[PDB]
């Protein structure tokens, strides 16, 4: 079965071209005579431009194939203009005209100058790899993918040794070892069918690594989670039920080790955990299961009275990095409680606890979020004392942050 037809250009487009040129009152047989001649020349060239596609070993007809197919038929590749003399440009392709159907048809002549030029890509290089080792295809990233008998483990001993080396490198004794192991996790195609043992090693590790608050052990495991996530080959949402309570624990937990000093890293432990938490709510999303569940736990962490301030700071960060609308709808009715907590830490003399440090970090983070939440939905008028209607927390400094954001927008 083949119902192949002969499609030509419409004749009602050929009369528009003729009467817009000075040739009026053309007959239909005169007009049909134009649209079978030019529809043959399009068919003659597209059959001839398919020769250059096959010879160049491509499956996509590029724009340059018609430039060589035209030159082959002794017609100039120039499309925009036609030179009768033909001497200024002799069968020289000018690359066509970058024109659109939905274009503006008028631009400003300094808009084209002030835009940044695109980056010239890398030059052609020759890398070698292995498709087959004595018949077997390796799983390198340059490749695509009555007694019962004594069973064998589903991992090979090269795979089991690889797992042991990657896990002993990912506990961060040496930094270059970590970084390669993290890139190896980030792009090994055959890292599926080893992923249960990696997820179990992560999950089990954080839970026996918060018994004593060992920050590096945790910062390395969170980097291992981040390296597991951006791998495109492996299927992760079968294992995310172990991954998510591990990261929530990094963000919402108390620190058993020295309270100050590494709190700077602790904020990053909560920064890396809140980054991977909102990346996990970005992926793996179905109706009302993952994002709303962690949002509900973060909000009942917030509205809980008389919290640990480490847990408070971590949950504040976690609810803060959830996107545009989430701080637009959630952080709004709670400024008074935040201010009262700050006032209590300030009044009570107790300085040797971690409450004061937790309070300062929470207030700074909340004030930065409130700044764009404001820069985003209102004009920058009355930036001096109108914020005193919102208890006067960030005030003019918040206004200065909004002004810096406006300057960044102007630079963009």
């Amino acid at each position: 079965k083949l119902k192949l037809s002969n499609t030509v250009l419409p004749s009602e487009s050929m009369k528009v071209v003729a009467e817009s040129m000075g040739i009026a009152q053309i007959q239909e047989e005169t007009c049909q005579l134009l649209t079978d001649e030019v529809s043959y020349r399009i068919k003659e060239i597209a059959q001839d431009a398919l020769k250059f596609m096959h010879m160049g070993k491509r499956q996509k007809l590029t724009t340059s194939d018609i430039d060589y197919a035209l030159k082959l038929k002794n017609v100039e590749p120039l499309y925009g203009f036609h030179a009768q003399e033909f001497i200024p440009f002799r069968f020289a392709s000018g690359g066509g005209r970058e024109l659109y159907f939905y274009e503006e048809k008028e631009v400003d002549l300094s808009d084209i100058i002030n835009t940044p030029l695109p980056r010239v890509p890398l030059d052609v290089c020759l890398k070698a790899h292995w498709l087959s080792i004595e018949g077997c295809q390796p799983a390198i990233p340059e490749n695509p993918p009555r007694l019962k008998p004594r069973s064998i483990h589903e991992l090979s001993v090269e795979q089991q040794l690889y797992y042991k080396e990657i896990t002993e490198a990912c506990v961060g004794s040496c930094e270059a070892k970590r970084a390669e192991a993290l890139q190896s996790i980030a792009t090994d195609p055959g890292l599926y069918q080893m992923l249960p043992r990696f997820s179990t090693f992560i999950s089990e590790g954080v839970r026996v690594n918060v018994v004593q608050n060992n920050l590096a052990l945790l910062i390395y495991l969170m980097r291992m989670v981040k390296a597991l996530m951006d791998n495109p080959t492996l299927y992760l949402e079968k294992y995310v039920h172990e991954l998510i309570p591990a990261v929530m624990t990094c963000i919402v937990s108390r620190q058993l080790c020295l309270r100050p000093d590494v709190d700077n890293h602790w904020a990053l432990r909560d920064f890396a955990a809140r980054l991977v938490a909102q990346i996990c709510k970005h992926f793996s999303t179905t109706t009302n299961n993952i994002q709303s569940r962690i949002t509900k736990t973060f909000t009942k962490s917030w509205v809980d009275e008389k919290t640990p301030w480490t847990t408070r700071y971590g949950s504040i960060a976690g609810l803060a990095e959830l996107g545009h609308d989430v701080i637009k709808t959630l952080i709004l009715p709670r400024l008074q409680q935040e201010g009262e907590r700050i006032r209590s830490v300030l009044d009570g003399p107790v300085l040797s606890n971690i409450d004061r440090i937790g309070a300062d970090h929470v207030q700074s983070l909340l004030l930065k979020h409130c700044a764009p939440v404001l820069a985003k939905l209102r004009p920058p008028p009355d930036n001096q004392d109108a914020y005193r209607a919102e208890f006067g927390s960030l005030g003019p400094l918040l206004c200065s942050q909004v002004v810096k954001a406006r300057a960044q927008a102007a630079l963009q």
């Binding site: 079968k238 995310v240 929530m248 108390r254 179905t286 736990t297």
Partner: peptide
């Protein structure tokens, strides 16, 4: 549609919130 593979993934069938360790000791 309740036999869709996702329904049976244990993220959508497990109270994994209970695992998060808060103030452990």
């Amino acid at each position: 549609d309740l036999l869709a593979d996702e329904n049976f993934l244990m993220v959508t069938q497990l109270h994994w919130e209970d695992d998060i360790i808060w103030d452990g000791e």
